[PDB]
């Protein structure tokens, strides 16, 4: 299912009581907008070609809304500083992620909104979009506040309405690219770099979306081999790459196989 997601970061300053606010928006794993309130006369800005098909009215309205949101997060930094009895001497962070997944009927499939303070879970909208889960006792204060004010219905109205409708609009606007998965381009490299043995490295490059599985298998053993596995990383052009490596005895390279799973592949892939 396609998704539309926003990631908000607010950071307080040990300084003049103001705060930095950064917002990024994604359709699936494709970033399409950004906002940064330290830019002069800050605007929501395009970050992918297809969203540049929007008129200036769109950018004006998105700018208005995200500037208001940044104000709200500025106040929230202070409030949470109070909840946790922290001084105004240090910098703190308030993060939110929210968004919607599109169902098979063109309606909301799953929606979410989650907040973290100083990098730890703070409060989350539950799957039913009508109740909250608080992570500690300060979050209980926030939860009582939002329950009494039916903030959950604000979230649910957005996720079931504007979120999915704007996502469908985006999928049509970027139909030339957003409907594409890119399968990994794969190869195995061999590095006889040590007396310890021969390093085999299985590479997957240029794939999209970012979810992938690379595993090494040795003939005669069912379990995956222990391996050196790097975290999935961006290629810079919107795709991703990953590799998995291990050291094998000098003459035994042929008994090892790298197995690749990605949604762009028409069958699971076995490499040597």
């Amino acid at each position: 299912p396609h998704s539309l997601s926003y990631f908000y970061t607010a950071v307080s300053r040990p300084d003049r009581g103001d705060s930095r606010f950064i917002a990024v928006g994604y359709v699936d794993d494709t970033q399409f907008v950004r906002f940064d309130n330290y830019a002069p006369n800050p605007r929501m800005e395009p970050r992918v070609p297809w969203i540049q098909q929007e008129g200036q009215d769109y950018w004006d309205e998105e700018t208005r809304k995200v500037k208001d949101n940044a104000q709200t997060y500025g106040v929230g930094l202070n409030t949470l500083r109070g909840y946790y009895n922290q001084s105004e001497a240090g910098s703190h962070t308030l993060q939110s992620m929210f968004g919607c997944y599109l169902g098979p009927d063109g309606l909301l499939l799953h929606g979410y909104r989650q907040d973290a303070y100083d990098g730890a879970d703070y409060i989350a909208l539950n799957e039913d979009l009508r109740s909250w889960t608080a992570a500690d006792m300060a979050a209980q204060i926030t939860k009582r506040k939002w329950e009494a004010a039916n903030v959950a219905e604000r979230r649910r109205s957005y996720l079931q309405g504007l979120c999915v409708e704007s996502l469908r609009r985006y999928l049509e606007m970027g139909k030339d690219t957003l409907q594409r998965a890119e399968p990994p381009k794969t190869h195995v490299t061999r590095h006889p770099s040590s007396d310890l043995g021969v390093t085999l490295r299985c590479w997957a490059l240029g794939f999209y979306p970012k979810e992938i599985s690379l595993t090494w298998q040795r003939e005669g053993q069912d379990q995956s081999q222990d391996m050196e596995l790097v975290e999935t990383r961006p290629s810079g052009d919107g795709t991703f790459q990953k590799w998995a490596a291990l050291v094998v005895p000098p003459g035994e390279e042929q008994s090892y196989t790298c197995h690749v799973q990605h949604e762009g592949l028409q069958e699971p892939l076995t490499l040597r």
Binding site: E62, K65, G76, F98, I123, K145, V151, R154, R155, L162
Partner: peptide
């Protein structure tokens, strides 16, 4: 398009 976040924590 963005949510409208306005309620205090």
């Amino acid at each position: 398009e963005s949510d409208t976040v306005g309620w205090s924590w």
